[PDB]
Structure formats: C-alpha cells, structure tokens
Design a protein around this ligand. Sequence first.
Ligand SMILES: Nc1ncnc2c1ncn2[C@@H]1O[C@H](COP(=O)(O)OP(=O)(O)NP(=O)(O)O)[C@@H](O)[C@H]1O
Ligand SMILES: Nc1ncnc2c1ncn2[C@@H]1O[C@H](COP(=O)(O)OP(=O)(O)NP(=O)(O)O)[C@@H](O)[C@H]1O
Ligand SMILES: CC(C)(C)OC(=O)NCCCC[C@H](N)C(=O)O
Ligand SMILES: CC(C)(C)OC(=O)NCCCC[C@H](N)C(=O)O
Ligand SMILES: [Mg+2]
Ligand SMILES: [Mg+2]
Ligand SMILES: [Mg+2]
Ligand SMILES: [Mg+2]
Lengths: 257, 257
Amino acid sequence: PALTKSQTDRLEVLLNPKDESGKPFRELESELLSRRKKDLQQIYAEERENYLGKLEREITRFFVDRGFLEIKSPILIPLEYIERMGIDNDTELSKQIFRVDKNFCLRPMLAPNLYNYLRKLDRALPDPIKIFEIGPCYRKESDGKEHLEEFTMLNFCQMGSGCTRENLESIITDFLNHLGIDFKIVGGDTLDVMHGDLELSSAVVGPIPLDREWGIDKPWIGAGFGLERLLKVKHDFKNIKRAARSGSYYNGISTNL
Amino acid sequence: PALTKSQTDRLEVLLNPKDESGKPFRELESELLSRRKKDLQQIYAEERENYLGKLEREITRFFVDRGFLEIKSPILIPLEYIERMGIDNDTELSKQIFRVDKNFCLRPMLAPNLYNYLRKLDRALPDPIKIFEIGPCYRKESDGKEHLEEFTMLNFCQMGSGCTRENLESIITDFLNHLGIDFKIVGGDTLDVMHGDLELSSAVVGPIPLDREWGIDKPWIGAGFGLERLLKVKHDFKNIKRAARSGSYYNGISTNL
Ligand SMILES: Nc1ncnc2c1ncn2[C@@H]1O[C@H](COP(=O)(O)OP(=O)(O)NP(=O)(O)O)[C@@H](O)[C@H]1O
Ligand SMILES: Nc1ncnc2c1ncn2[C@@H]1O[C@H](COP(=O)(O)OP(=O)(O)NP(=O)(O)O)[C@@H](O)[C@H]1O
Ligand SMILES: CC(C)(C)OC(=O)NCCCC[C@H](N)C(=O)O
Ligand SMILES: CC(C)(C)OC(=O)NCCCC[C@H](N)C(=O)O
Ligand SMILES: [Mg+2]
Ligand SMILES: [Mg+2]
Ligand SMILES: [Mg+2]
Ligand SMILES: [Mg+2]
C-alpha cells in the first residue's frame, strides 16, 4: 500500500524535475522507466551532447569571445603547489587533498597553475592579461548533496588594467545571465555568488599577500565556479550527483534502467 | 663560437617548426624570443583557443555528427576496474598505475567506463549503440619523447549492428583524413594505426573474451587515440611535451620567455 523509503529512493532516481500517489510501486516504476528510456532515446536521436561537456564548451565560447585565453593545465600537480597556496594544516583544505605518489596530488583547485600562467604571460602579452580554465578538481568531502569529490571548475581572471570589483561583478553578472542562472552577489576583497544557500562561486579582488609567492605584482580579479553546481541549479537537479561525471547518470537521466 | 649543447637545447625550446648557424647564442635567442612573443600575441589577439581543447571540440563534433553519444566518465576510478580489465602483474600496465588512496587509481584508459555505458545503454537505446569519450588518462612512463604521464585519450566504439573491421577502418580513415594526419593501418582482431614508427592508435574488433566480465555479448568495434600524439604529428612538434597540458608551453610556444 504505502511505498517504502527504499522504494521512494528508487523512484526519485528515475524521477525527473519535469514530471507531474496511490498506484503500486511496480506500476509507478515501470511508468518512470519507459519515460527515461524515452528521454535517453531522444538525446541519442537529436542532440547526443553531454551536459557537462556542452556546458564547458558554452563557458569556453563565452570567455574566448570576451578576450580571455583558454588554458589547459595539468590536473596532477606537485604537492609543493599546495604548500605555496598557503594551505597549511590550519585550513580545511589540508585534509581534502588526494595525494598521488610521494610528490604529487590531484589539483583541488586551478589557482596555482593560473598563477604561473599570469606571471609568464605578463612577459609576452599586452596588459591586461586575461585567462581562464575549465577542468577537473578533487577534494575529499563529507557532504554529498552539494559536494562531489571529483568536480569541474571554471576559473577566469584578469590581471593589470581594469581590475576592479565593479568589473568583476559585471563579468559575473553577464556570465550567469547568459546561462540563465539566478544569483545574488554577497560579501583582499572577497565575494560569494549565491543561489539560495548554495555557493555557486567565490571571487576575489586582488592584489592579495599570497601574490608575492607566485611572482605577481599587479591588481587582478577572478572567480571560480563549480560546473556541476551550475548544472544543478539550471536543470533543477535535487542532488548534485546527477550532474557529475559518472556511470549512474547521463544528462541527469538514470542509466540504471 | 660553437653553441654548447645546453645552449642548443634552449634554442630548440624557442624553436618552432616553421622557422628557417654562425651568429652568437645571445643573438639567436633574442631573435627567437621576439618571435615567440609575436606568435603568442597573435593567438591572444585573433584565436585565443587552446590546441588541446580545440582538438577535443573538433573530435567531439566529428563523432557527434556521426551518431556517437558523448560521454564524460570519472577520471578517478576504482582499482577493481583495473583487475577486471585483465591487467595482472603479468602485463606492463600493472606497473604504470597511479594509485590514489587504498581503493582508487587514475584511469590509465577509458575502457572500463565505456564498457559500463555499453551494457547500460544497450537496455535503453536502439541497436547499434555508439559512444565515445575524450578525457585525461594516466600512466607511469620511462620515455618522454612519445609518452606523457598525463595524456588525453579519445575512445569511440560501436556495439551491435555493422561492427566489422571494414567499418572500423572506414571510421579511422575518415577521422584522420578529416584532421589531416597521415597514417597507415597495420595488424579478437587487433589493429594499430601508425604514423612512421609512432603509434597513433590501437583498435580492436570484438567480441573478445574480456567482454563477458563486463556483461557484453554482442559484436563491437572501437579504437583509442592519444590527442597529444595527433597534435605532435599535425603541428610537427619534435617532442610530445609541446602538446601536453603544461605550464611550459602554450599551443606549442614556450612560455619561458
Ligand atoms: N566539492 C565540490 N563539489 C562541487 N563543487 C565544488 C566543490 N568544491 C568547490 N566547488 C565549487 O568551486 C567553487 C570555488 O571553490 P571554493 O571557493 O574553494 O569552494 P568552497 O569555498 O570550498 N565552497 P564550499 O565547500 O561549498 O563551502 C565553489 O564555490 C563551488 O562552486
Ligand atoms: N603515455 C602515453 N602518452 C601519450 N599517449 C599515449 C600514452 N599511452 C597511450 N597513449 C595513446 O593512447 C593510444 C591507445 O592506448 P594503448 O594502445 O594502450 O597505447 P600503448 O599500446 O600503451 N602505446 P605505446 O605505449 O606507445 O606502445 C596509444 O596508441 C597512444 O596514441
Ligand atoms: C588567489 C586565489 C588562489 C585565491 O585565486 C586565484 O589565484 N585565481 C582565481 C581565484 C578564483 C576564486 C577562488 N580562489 C577559487 O578557488 O575559485
Ligand atoms: C576491450 C578494450 C578494453 C580493449 O577496448 C574497449 O573496451 N574499448 C575501446 C578500445 C579502444 C582500443 C584500445 N583498447 C585502447 O586502449 O585504446
Ligand atoms: Mg569546501
Ligand atoms: Mg568559498
Ligand atoms: Mg604503453
Ligand atoms: Mg597499442
């Protein structure tokens, strides 16, 4: 008669935001099953593009058109970069690092590599230097509703001329308005782009003391966004896992049919 | 008078395939330096796209237009997948795995995830099932002229109808001809796509015994290509490192100016 918690969980997996009690579990499940196969079949026939990939390409076109240089840096970076990022056994991050071998780890952020690119490009390109990168990042997490251990990050930044908070907020605003994501900006000067109680991004207006360790000596602005969180808001997924790289979902549809 | 080996190495770093002795090192280096800044400045003004990223997008459009489903699976996979891929302490791969924690490792290939997608999608999509994925892979290597420890792989495959060697070679041929890469196909049936003595890809025509461990029971074809190797051939880089994710090069130009 009444659906068990476990049965409800299974139904929620097959449930899509677009869908609209009483009937038995087997009926409800068969209904949802035929629907997802249908959605999957539609993707396969018409678009065939992966949400995460499609988003990355959409973000790339956005910044490339706005004068930012597309960067693809190593995902596997030296542990030494962590220490130099000011990540000591005093911050939360220190306990979220996935170590590899004895000298490396999985980048928990894009900052270090972008820092290097800013210093190096400054010697070859005209002010201001504008770069961005979209790629995998890794952190050990306790949560699983707004956090993934393997997520995708977007970090763009400008160094030199025009690096003001107003300009930064202008970029943030044009970006999210372009993607159709509702947000509110709240807040070296630091800002947080929020959607409800979900943190979409953290932005900072430099210069900041840490800049010196990386050979940076000019003002700059920048923000980092989690692609899965943007996907979560846009497609209204209730759980961040439906947007993550995985073998359990495809464009938010359960592959366990 | 004569350039030292070390000076030659430095010049080669700044050297591009398009360029055309006697003069002193400082002169030669200053000449090359102004040239690279120029190239970099041109990229920044006109295109702004990263080679590796641009290639991925070009590969994606290719297969998407040809009916293949774009997949983005986890880069950090379970070690159990390695064992199930038939990778024992009998093969070379067993010694090339980058372990993470006690139960995970960095995917040294895309096979396991794609295997799962084939089994699952088979229950929802019409035959044949066509999928592909482009993403980072990791292997410990002794070489550094044709091997990277962090490289990018493309693996496409079709399961069900039309899975013949002829069709496989046809896909391979249209693909490389599209990218403008010279090659020769040589060779469960297995093929190697070569460029000189450089292995561009390994393709296999199933079914193969390993299929059973993953719940696969239909014929299939597929090939895996290294994106950095394709870039190496296309842009004529002498060293694979100029195409790799890095902080030392950008679209093959040295960032150490
Ligand atoms: N574990 C994660 N899973 C998914 N996205 C993440 C994760 N960690 C960070 N992000 C995204 O990356 C953005 C910038 O990173 P960062 O500012 O370090 O996040 P945080 O401050 O760790 N956020 P949070 O853990 O939710 O309090 C965050 O605002 C998120 O959009
Ligand atoms: N270490 C690497 N660096 C760059 N590309 C690689 C690397 N390993 C494999 N690839 C690419 O991935 C393709 C398919 O993988 P695989 O067939 O396992 O390579 P392999 O057989 O290990 N090739 P090789 O190591 O040169 O003899 C190879 O043909 C290369 O194009
Ligand atoms: C200075 C630092 C590391 C905080 O930020 C950068 O160097 N670059 C981009 C910053 C993006 C905001 C925030 N640092 C993030 O992790 O997303
Ligand atoms: C069966 C197996 C694992 C060898 O291949 C696949 O399951 N899928 C794609 C194969 C691509 C060729 C080769 N396996 C490679 O690693 O590129
Ligand atoms: Mg956190
Ligand atoms: Mg934050
Ligand atoms: Mg090998
Ligand atoms: Mg091979």
